[PDB]
Design a protein around this nucleic acid. Structure first.
Ligand code: ZN
Lengths: 94, 237
RNA sequence: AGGCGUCGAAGCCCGGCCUCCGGGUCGGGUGGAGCCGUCCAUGAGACACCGCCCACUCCCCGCUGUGUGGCUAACCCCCGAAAGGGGGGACAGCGGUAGGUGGGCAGUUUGGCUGGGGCGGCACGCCUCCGAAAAGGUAUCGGAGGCGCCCUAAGGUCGGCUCAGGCGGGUCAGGAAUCCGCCGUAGAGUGCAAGGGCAAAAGCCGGCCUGACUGGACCCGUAACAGAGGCGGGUCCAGCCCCGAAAGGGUGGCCUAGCGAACCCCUGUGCCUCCCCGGUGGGGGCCAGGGAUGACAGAAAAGCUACCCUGGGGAUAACAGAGUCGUCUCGGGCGAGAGCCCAUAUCGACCCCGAGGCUUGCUACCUCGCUGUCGGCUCUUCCCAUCCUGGCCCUGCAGCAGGGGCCAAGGGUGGGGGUGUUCACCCAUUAAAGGGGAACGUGAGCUGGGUUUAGACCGUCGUGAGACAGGUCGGAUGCUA
RNA sequence: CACAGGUCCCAGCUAGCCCGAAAGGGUUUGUACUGGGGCCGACGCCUGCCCAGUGCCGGUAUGUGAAGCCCGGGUACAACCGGGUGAAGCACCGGUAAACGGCGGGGGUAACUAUAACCCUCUUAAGGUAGCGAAAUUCCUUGUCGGUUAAAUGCCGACCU
RNA sequence: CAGUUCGCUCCCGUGACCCCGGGCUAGGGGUGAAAGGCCAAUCGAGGCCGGAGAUAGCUGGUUCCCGCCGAAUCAUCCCGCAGGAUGGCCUCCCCGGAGGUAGGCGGUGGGGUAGAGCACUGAUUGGAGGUGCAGGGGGCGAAAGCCCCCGGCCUCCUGUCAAACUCCGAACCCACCGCCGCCGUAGAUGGGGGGAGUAGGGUGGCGGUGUAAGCCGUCCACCGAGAGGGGAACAACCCAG
RNA sequence: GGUUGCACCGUCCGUCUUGAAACACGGGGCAGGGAGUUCGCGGCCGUGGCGAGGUUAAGGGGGUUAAGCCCCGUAGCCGC
RNA sequence: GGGGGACCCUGAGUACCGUCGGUUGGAUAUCCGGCGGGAAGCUGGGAGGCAUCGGCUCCCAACCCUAAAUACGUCCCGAG
């Protein structure tokens, strides 16, 4: 699936239609400073069995696209609706 | 599951304990303070059969008045005179420091360290060969075929242990085996793990065959070391 | 673009040296005044000079760890009451911490539907047609198929055009290349299954564009009537926009599938907040998008039990009973044909209509707080679709015998070999050595050989515990009516 | 089941194997003709091929590999992020089958008709040798032939599918 | 006689033999010539007491009378299928005040079943006519070709079809409006609250499935939860509540 | 009122179950015992007090043979 | 009994930091214990719910004792 690299669309901050670059969100590892990770590491310590579920090989064949659109004028990013599912995602300058 | 015979042996129950009251006593050398820098002569008084020793024993009465039990070497004579010390003649029945035994001689009852009392080569029909004599160590070839280094001051006796050749004659009878092993309280008769129950042995089961390779790792925990333990190889070479 | 030089330079001699022995650096010595480039070539200029450097290398000082060798003084081992002596030795042992291995030892899981259960399959999440009974709804391991995608165009809008197939005519050119005329209600096409809808289009070819957007309402469906987290769809208000002359159209794909809670985490975007106040780092919170649970309204999860135990179930199997007769056994209708001619002496194709409950099967209606199995022995009784014994009819019935059929159930229908066998096969006799019902008659009558526990062996399958409607040896039968 | 006999494995002593929370202890008043651990199982003749798979043993140049330590960033200090060092273990290489276990298939085969027997070649490590065979192993099965009986789902001998 | 005995028969009887007294090994432990055997009539983990009145969706039981109304076994969800929750159906109390509709007549709309039919899509016997049609095979001819048939494709006639066909099409069912009838101010339609039970249904008519029995839905009539009079007895059939 | 005769009718009791006289389970007789209890929280209804207020808790005093009886007790809780 | 001082004293393997186990509502912010580190000490030190800096407030650990209001009933009066 081809997708334009840039598109003209509404900007919540400029309150008008401006040129927006198309970007893909880059997934990041869990932060060890977060409260959830802190609690997980706190309960992992000591004796006992594993305290959480351990899913194995539980992945969707195709994942939805998590795209952000950045305004070329104000430089802020936003989301445009909900993502869709395509196995091949390509960005074309058109 | 249940315990193995080897595990149960570790608890020292009467089923597995040595009956160390039928025997003639412990066989150890005279204290090193008597042997060092002084040679004593002793007279052999009697030669006896120790129930569990695998070798005959003998009583020696020393000049100083000490009565001791020793492992009689082949050819020892009742009423014979033996010597223990650094200045004793090289002969059968005499005990010398390892540094004073010419190379190529057969010795028995070798002390691991000077004065311990003798630990090596005490079974009937065994001997060790004195190979080399160095200021720091004396090399001796043991019955297993290993060249071990001993401190020069270790004490050993010249000759061979009497009673060799037993294995030439078959036991023939299960009753003969019964008496032999009862003399020492060694576990007999012995069962087979493959014909044991699965609860009792790793190889147990209704189908009489091990379900796993019989070579067990050296890192296996107690209750798992059965069969060939840490075997480099198996079969007929 | 000038720099060096008694602030001692060119041109030869060898000495040590590194090194692509390219070629360069340098101590000593006769030496006593000269040597490069701006000039040009090189993509990038000076071995003119002043500086930070990168690429290998060694050396002096300081620190830091690793490996090896050695020492004894901690520590360990032996002798000895002790004294003390000997051996090992900063290892080992011990304490703390970090990873691996680990059925040696434990707690657990190993789902459900199911014409019993298991194997099989998913009827376990969705979409179309029929079932479905002309409003709505309606089930089965009912029938026939599809989905777990793809598309920056296959999305929005505006303009223009009309398809499949056929006929007649044309250079290569034929069945099919590329054309010209006519007929042509869609017999074409739609991104994809099916259904429906679409012809001056929703199809085909072009122009511009991103409404496949932001902040929110009400309503229908999943889920009728009649409750719903999540999800999908419809009608609108505002913002900023796309197309068009304008009306008018645009909140993805012509409508119906292509997907998913809590907790946690990632990202965007602005705000609130963190224990007496204030700042900094960091944390928490509200809103939006995303990572998946297919057992698809969302536990993370392998088997044996024949040593088994418990609570139940005739809601559910094996024997027997009950319903049915597909199958089984036994009759009938028609008559092609075979029988020297002759359909019916005898056989009787291809078709069709029945009887019994004596084989097997199907169902799951009674019986799982217990109705003891196959076979044999003993004993009693009944049916005729009759094997012999009594009496008859037809005959392709000379006699002796045969083939078909009718009435007839009073009597008989026996003895042995292998095999647990019923049965079947075989032997010698006989008039014949008929088939069946009675809880597959009969274990409060017997026997216990087979079957179906607990022991054991072989073959095969399984890593294993084990399993085998595969063989094989052994394996209890209660009673005072 | 055991048994005498066979053979394999660990261990030179503060060992090997084992009980335990530890202290200490069993084998041990022991010392390789010994102690401990498996399998077969008197006696006679013999025990063939295979190390790819699982297991065990040795090496481990190289990759990965936890904490600790070091370096840079970050924090007025930490939390935190990136890199270096990196043991055991795995990856990797070799031995090992009286360790667990395996020892098929075709292309074919010709000469006489079947037979195909010697015999040559490929999938993966090798393609079942000496022996025994309808067997406590054989489905078809009451296999076939011979003996035993008048009659043989039995028994004995043989054949090999 | 005995919670393992008695008789006959049988086996060992100088050895791995039989027995006695004093000792040690204790429960995931002991002991075991290996049978999961034995460990005080108990052993695939002993006995005693305590946790403990353990838990179970599984089985059984639950005690006085009369009076009034009176069900359900069917939809969605659950490791759900012998169990639960939300609904539907029952009962009791209260607010509201002017309507409501099980039956019928007429009208305005919707439908695609039974039946029928070939106008589409797919099947179907034969005959006639037209088409060289990549058919195909033969006669004919060195070769290019014609002439025969058979086949394919169209029109017609003839003889037959469809749960996943329809050019047509009822009975009949549903929504709404007017009216008759009935109910309702002694308070309906409707709204709020309290308490449930019900999640195995059966017979009968119809539809899909099956050789049939049967299985699975649908219709709400009867038994379940129903007396009396009959069918000889009979759940379900007739009269009757 | 006890027993008995005649005519007609009538296949016990409890229980699971669609279905019980059942060849389905519990049923020799009699007497006695025997199974929706208590607390905490919450939703409702029947009645009574007060009312933009309501109500005390622990505890204190008086009196009493007595734990009965009288008064105080606003912390606290709910509502506005 | 009161005023002044510029001199002296005021608890160490302790407080505290890192890590591991247990425990706790204690949540980066409960308490106890092990291991490895470890001060100031009056010109001093500690607490104020993640860490650090400044202000403010409140305190002086690492030594010891303490009646009454309370828990119980083998037992004794009294009551239902
Ligand atoms: Zn902007």
């Amino acid at each position: 699936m081809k997708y334009p690299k840039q598109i003209r669309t509404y900007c919540p901050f400029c309150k008008k239609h401006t040129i927006h670059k198309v970007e893909r969100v880059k997934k990041r590892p869990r932060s060890e400073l977060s409260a959830g990770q802190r609690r997980f590491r706190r309960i992992l310590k000591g004796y006992g069995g594993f305290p959480r579920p351990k899913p194995e090989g539980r992945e969707k064949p195709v994942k939805k696209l998590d795209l952000r659109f950045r305004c070329t004028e104000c430089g802020k990013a936003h989301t445009r609706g909900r993502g869709f599912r395509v196995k091949k995602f390509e960005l074309v300058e058109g | 599951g249940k315990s193995l015979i080897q595990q149960r042996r570790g608890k020292g129950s009467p089923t597995f304990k040595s009956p160390s009251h039928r025997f003639r006593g412990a066989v150890k050398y005279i204290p090193l303070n008597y042997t060092q820098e002084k040679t004593l002569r002793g007279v052999v008084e009697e030669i006896m059969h120790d129930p569990g020793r695998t070798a005959p024993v003998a009583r020696v009465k020393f000049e100083n008045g000490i009565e001791k039990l020793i492992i009689a070497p082949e050819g020892l004579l009742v009423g014979q005179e033996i010597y223990i010390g650094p200045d004793a003649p090289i002969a059968v029945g005499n005990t010398l420091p390892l540094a004073k035994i010419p190379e190529g001689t057969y010795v028995y009852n070798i002390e691991g360290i000077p004065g311990d009392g003798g630990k090596y080569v005490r079974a009937g029909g065994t001997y060790a060969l004195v190979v080399s004599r160095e200021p720091d160590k004396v090399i001796v070839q043991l019955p297993s075929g290993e060249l071990k280094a001993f401190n020069p001051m270790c004490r050993a006796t010249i000759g061979v242990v009497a009673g060799g050749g037993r294995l030439e004659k078959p036991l023939v009878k299960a009753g003969k085996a019964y008496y032999k092993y009862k003399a020492r309280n060694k576990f007999w008769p012995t069962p087979r793990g493959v014909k044991m129950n699965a609860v009792n042995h790793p190889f147990g089961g209704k189908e009489h065959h091990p379900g796993k390779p019989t070579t067990t790792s050296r890192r296996a925990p107690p209750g798992r070391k059965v069969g060939h333990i840490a075997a480099r190889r198996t079969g007929r070479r």
